[PDB]
């Protein structure tokens, strides 16, 4: 709710977890390990504006 | 090249932007906006693993 990062699982479900923005990159990414199993370098990083116009 | 995030721009032309990944995520999205111009907030944060199989 915080901050929940959008990722995608290997399999495709969606998947949904809260981090602090201040929060390291690497350390985000991280979680995303304890989340499913996966290397940070792996996730890929995305970044997309959507100003609700 | 040491670390360019994927972004895409509100265009829609893909944009590319190395940065630390030890970076805070607020400062990596707040170069976005010197990049074109668009809040921190609105950047989708996105990850996707993909293990070059």
Do not use: W, Y
């Not at 977890?17 to 979680?31: G, M």
């Not at 290397?39 to 890929?44: F, K, L, M, T």
Request: proline letters at 6%; hydrophobic letters at 35%; zero cysteines.
């Amino acid at each position: 709710g915080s901050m929940q990062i959008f990722v995608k699982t290997l399999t495709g479900k969606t998947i949904t977890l809260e981090v602090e923005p201040s929060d390291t990159i690497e350390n985000v990414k991280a979680k995303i390990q304890d989340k499913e199993g996966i290397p940070p370098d792996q996730q890929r990083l995305i970044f997309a504006g959507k100003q609700l116009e």
